[PDB]
Amino acid sequence: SNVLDGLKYAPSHEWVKHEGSVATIGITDHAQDHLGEVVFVELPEPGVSVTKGKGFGAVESVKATSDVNSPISGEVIEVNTGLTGKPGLINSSPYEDGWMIKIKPTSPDELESLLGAKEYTKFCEEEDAAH
Ligand SMILES: *C(=O)CCCC[C@@H](CCSCN)SSCCO
């Protein structure tokens, strides 16, 4: 599991990349690895609001269907419609082409409660080690 240096991470294995007025959201390399082959993604409609810590979509693999929760609150301004044709982009590039939603974050300080990269790598170590 690759973990990128400038993202913030939630315990449930979703990342946020923040770039000013916009925050992009996807699930991590860890998350796709443990999901297996992703066969379907349920993404929200544009204009919808997402709230920090609440499911905004689901990702269906050959073995599981999990909720993907929003790491921060805001408004879905854009959705990766690429995931309809190739869902697998989540497996092949969880941090670049497999991004799920782009939001306009409504509460910026939310970023400060998320895990930075060493805290998330460590938590993933503790999870891998918990079996
Ligand atoms: C197979 O049974 C694995 C279930 C899928 C687990 C992964 C879901 C990530 S989608 C982001 N919410 S994460 S590993 C277990 C929980 O930390």
From Swiss-Prot:
Methyltransferase recorded as keyword: no
Domain named Lipoyl-binding: residues: 22-104
Protein name: Glycine cleavage system H protein, mitochondrial
An example Gene Ontology CC term for this record: glycine cleavage complex
Cofactor: (R)-lipoate
UniProt cofactor note: Binds 1 lipoyl cofactor covalently.
Top-level taxon of the source organism: Eukaryota
Native organism: Pisum sativum
GO BP, sorted A to Z: glycine decarboxylation via glycine cleavage system
Main localization category: mitochondrion
Lineage, top ranks: Eukaryota, Viridiplantae, Streptophyta, Embryophyta, Tracheophyta
Annotated family: Belongs to the GcvH family.
Subunit and interaction comment: The glycine cleavage system is composed of four proteins: P, T, L and H.
Function: The glycine cleavage system catalyzes the degradation of glycine. The H protein shuttles the methylamine group of glycine from the P protein to the T protein.
